[PDB]
């Protein structure tokens, strides 16, 4: 809980000193070699730091990276042509795709999470890599089934999901509301999993405005999707009393992200 009282600025310096600041000059000049470390930082931020300081804003990679440059002097010597090519590269870096789901109850205040054994494994949403020629929706259906025992092919909605680049992967979690609250979960094809449980969203580290996190739970790439989720639900609730779902998706590295970049960068 080192970063509970750090300002945003102090957090930015740390992440810099930690990941990019002290790299060999050549690695700072390598879009790839630098993009990798920045991808690590952005994840360290969303996954560890925001967890002890919810005041800190949830950022898409592209925005987080811009603010990480402000705390990295060795990057200040470089062209607009250069910094734009980098951001380009952040936008389109060939990354391994990962698909899965955020399973919610009917009332949208509880979600399904999966835990390995190991004490070094934190809870996480069901998700995995893509098998050859397999489709995004089809990969999600499969991962959920393998990890959870629950077949979601009848409720999964190809139009409803959250996209986000985190720790060098392109994560897409389909959002499937209305999962039976006494579904029985199984993991017989996935011997690594020890627990699969409903958690209250309000107990998740950054979910409620000023609830501090108890040191009794570890979460993997959960925290980063919580901002886009709150947004998803807000919108899906508007849709519920106006029309009919379908449209509702949230892409973290898209417009929301370029709007904020323009505000910083102008």
């Amino acid at each position: 809980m080192s970063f509970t009282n750090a300002t945003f600025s102090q957090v930015l310096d740390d992440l810099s000193a930690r990941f990019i600041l002290n790299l060999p000059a050549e690695e700072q000049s390598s879009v790839e070699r630098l993009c990798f470390q920045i991808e690590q930082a952005h994840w360290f931020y969303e996954d560890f730091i925001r967890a002890q300081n919810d005041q800190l804003p949830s950022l898409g990679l592209r925005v987080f990276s811009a603010k990480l440059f402000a705390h990295c002097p060795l990057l200040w010597k470089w062209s607009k042509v250069h910094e734009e090519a980098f951001d380009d590269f952040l936008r389109y870096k060939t990354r391994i795709p990962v698909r899965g789901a955020i399973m919610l109850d009917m009332s949208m205040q509880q979600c399904v999470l999966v835990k390995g054994w190991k004490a070094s494994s934190g809870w996480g949403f069901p998700k995995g890599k893509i098998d050859k020629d397999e489709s995004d929706v089809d990969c999600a259906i499969r991962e959920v089934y393998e990890e959870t025992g629950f077949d979601c092919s009848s409720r999964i909605n190809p139009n409803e999901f959250i996209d986000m680049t985190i720790r060098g992967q392109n994560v897409r979690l389909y959002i499937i509301p209305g999962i039976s609250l006494d579904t029985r979960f199984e993991s017989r094809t996935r011997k690594e999993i020890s627990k699969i449980e409903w958690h209250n969203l309000m107990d998740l580290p950054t979910f409620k405005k000023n609830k501090p996190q108890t040191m009794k739970n570890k979460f993997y790439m959960v925290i980063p999707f919580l901002a886009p989720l709150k947004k998803w639900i807000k919108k899906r609730n508007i849709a519920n009393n106006t029309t009919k779902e379908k449209n509702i998706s949230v892409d973290v590295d898209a417009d929301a992200s370029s709007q904020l970049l323009s505000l910083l960068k102008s």
Binding site: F3, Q10, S16, A17, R18, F19, N22, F44, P73, K77
Partner: protein, 123 residues
């Protein structure tokens, strides 16, 4: 320009003092170090940026700002004889009589730190 380095130093020292306010000086830095222990080498979770620091009471030591979790390492090197170069590790005999193995991914960092360590605990 050298300005960037004066700037890079100040940030480094802030970052460390924020974690450890007793630290007064940074001697040297290795970008990527991995930490190993004994019982034969075992791999630890700690791996990240290495800073060779000097204490306010003048104690030489090092900080790894860990890349895998916010759980950093900070150990003192009490006497020059507590360190050795074997098998590309910089080997360190802790106060708690643990054997630590430091792996500088850059061999050059390895030699430079070892040497400056001996020099800094010499004087």
């Amino acid at each position: 320009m050298e300005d960037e380095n004066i700037l890079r130093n100040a940030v480094n020292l802030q970052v460390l003092k924020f974690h450890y306010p007793e630290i007064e000086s940074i001697i040297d830095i290795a970008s990527h170090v991995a930490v190993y222990q004994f019982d034969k080498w075992l791999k630890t979770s700690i791996e990240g940026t290495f800073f060779l620091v000097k204490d306010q009471r003048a104690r030489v030591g090092y900080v790894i700002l860990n890349r895998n979790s916010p759980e950093n390492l900070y150990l003192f090197i009490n006497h020059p004889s507590n360190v050795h170069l074997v098998d590309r590790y910089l080997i360190h005999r802790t106060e708690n009589q643990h054997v630590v193995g430091l792996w500088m991914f850059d061999p050059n960092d390895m030699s430079r730190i070892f040497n400056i360590v001996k020099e800094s605990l010499l004087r």
